[model samples]
Target: MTKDQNGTWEMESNENFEGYMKALDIDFATRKIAVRLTQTKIIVQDGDNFKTKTNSTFRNYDLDFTVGVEFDEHTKGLDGRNVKTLVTWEGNTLVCVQKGEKENRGWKQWVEGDKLYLELTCGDQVCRQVFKKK
Candidate 1:
């Protein structure tokens, strides 16, 4: 059965994050540190409203919004820029689109059985991440 994930989840692998960072125009030094450090995602959902925080030793970023509602997103500590962000639902998957400076920037996540899958995109670069229950 698919799992219902409504809490905090941590990154278990860096995988192809280096490419993603590169697409965002991240500098060499920041990319090197960010790719090596572990990251954690904290999601809080209540009805249609949601709050999210992505944390790491290097930096932390938080996002708060409601489903189907669009807002401005400033990705700090990474690219340090602003973009129009929106989150929508497709079946059980949560999809996000960040429009601005970068082309084809967005991310989607879903839970299946005991695993969680995430797809991060920036420009033409796409990074896939999978996490197993600990």
Candidate 2:
């Protein structure tokens, strides 16, 4: 069986998140709040389908998609932009590619030991966030 990533994970470390937000052109006030807020990731996966939520006191984001399928994604609280989104699996790592006005935008997620790792990328900035199982 594949390693199950169906649980709530609390944010432990967020590195270079401010730079990532800046690459998205997030405002100063919002970026300041976003950088300080603790984020929680809730993931529910069934076979090739997945529902994921990124929650925080400042803003929240929800995404639903199936592996190998492409969909239009509106990043509500993040950048408030629409993009063509595709998610696929590279081994056990869940990789997402977002095509929009911005170049090289995407995220990758995977579980390691008792922690969940998220790598968010936009432009030339990359943010690495680690979360602990909750």
Candidate 3:
């Protein structure tokens, strides 16, 4: 079961974001710009369908999908890869598994009190980010 994450979220802090970006093979120049970005997360959930977007001054990422159905994920500005994406719910956690050239790529997300947390994983690296509800 997914938690009530349908709200506006503002980035509070992040940890190991550069490590995760390196794991995704992002260039050094991009990493420098990415680390300083202030991102905003928006989640609109209705039943099993979710429309999520991450907003930033540098770049933005959007994902809209159902709980079980697989979708073609074109990570355009991010990794610039065409991958298969599927999201699922595990208890109160929302989990996503992306299958493509990169192995072990996914994200785990959950809401804690008034804060939302994200664990973005690629290969052996994980980037943990915290956001406060707006």
Find the candidate with the highest lDDT and give its number: 2
Residues 26-101, candidate 2, lDDT per residue (tens digit)?
A: 7645555666666777787888787777787765656667888876766666677778788887767687887766
Q: Is candidate 1 or candidate 2 better by lDDT?
A: 2
Tens-digit lDDT string for candidate 3 (79-124): 7777777788776766887776755677767776687788777878
Colliding residue pairs in candidate 1: none
Off by over 4 Å in 2: 36-38, 72-75
Question: After TM-score superposition, what is the CA distance of residue 91 in candidate 1 from its true location, in Å?
Answer: 4.7
**Count of backbone collisions in candidate 3:** 0
**Candidate models: Cα lDDT each:** 0.69, 0.73, 0.72
Write model 1 residue lDDT over 17-134, tens digit each, in one string: 7777678777755565666555786666676666666766765655567778876776666677788788886656577878767566777777755656777788788888866644
Clashes of 1: 0
Query: Where does model 1 exceed 4 Å of error?
Result: 1-4, 72-76, 80-82, 100-102
Q: Supply the TM-score for candidate 3.
A: 0.77
lDDT of 1 at 104: 69
Query: Quick one: ranking by lDDT, best first?
Result: 2, 3, 1
- Against the true structure, candidate 2 has what lDDT? 0.73
Model 2 RMSD in angstroms:
2.5
